[PDB]
Amino acid sequence: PFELSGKWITSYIGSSDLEKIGENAPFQVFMRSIEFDDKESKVYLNFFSKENGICEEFSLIGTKQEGNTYDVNYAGNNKFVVSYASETALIISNINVDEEGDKTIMTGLLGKGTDIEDQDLEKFKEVTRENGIPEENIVNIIERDDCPA
Numbered sequence: 001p002f003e004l005s006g007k008w009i010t011s012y013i014g015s016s017d018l019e020k021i022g023e024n025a026p027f028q029v030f031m032r033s034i035e036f037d038d039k040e041s042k043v044y045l046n047f048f049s050k051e052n053g054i055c056e057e058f059s060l061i062g063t064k065q066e067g068n069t070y071d072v073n074y075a076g077n078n079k080f081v082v083s084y085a086s087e088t089a090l091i092i093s094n095i096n097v098d099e100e101g102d103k104t105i106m107t108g109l110l111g112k113g114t115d116i117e118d119q120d121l122e123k124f125k126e127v128t129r130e131n132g133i134p135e136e137n138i139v140n141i142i143e144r145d146d147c148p149a
């Protein structure tokens with residue numbers, strides 16, 4: 001089988017709205033771990049983001065919802081699915097509705113730490129594309145993640 005829980009670090013993120021992912025933006029997210037607790041219908045997320053250019057750490061809890069889905073409060077309301085899982089990667093698709101009501105679709109490629117497999121990367125690009133997110137709306141997060149391990 002397939003272990004979904006553990007260390008996951010963000011390699012790349014794509015977004016329908018570039019305001020949500022540049023420097024210091026709420027969805028420029030540097031993942032550190034995700035733990036799925038299906039017994040209690042919960043997911044545990046630990047990650048860094050930057051504000052004011054300095055690392056801040058978050059540990060959040062989402063709730064398992066209908067189908068394959070999870071709801072979590074962060075910079076508005078979020079519904080995400082693990083669209084793809086391999087031994088080496090997860091691709092997450094997330095819809096965020098922010099505090100103004102604006103809706104953003106994002107995708108995120110995660111791995112076990114820095115050395116990306118091209119096969120996982122190609123699947124990320126296809127999922128991103130399928131969600132209507134253009135290639136130039138992809139940020140390389142590996143390059144930007146200087147937060148603590």
Ligand SMILES: O=C(OCc1ccccc1)c1ccccc1
Pocket residue numbers: 010013014027029031045072074078080092093094106107108109110
């Ligand atoms: O890496 C991500 O963590 C998921 C996540 C989802 C919601 C809140 C926190 C973390 C990610 C990437 C792109 C889009 C959405 C999420």
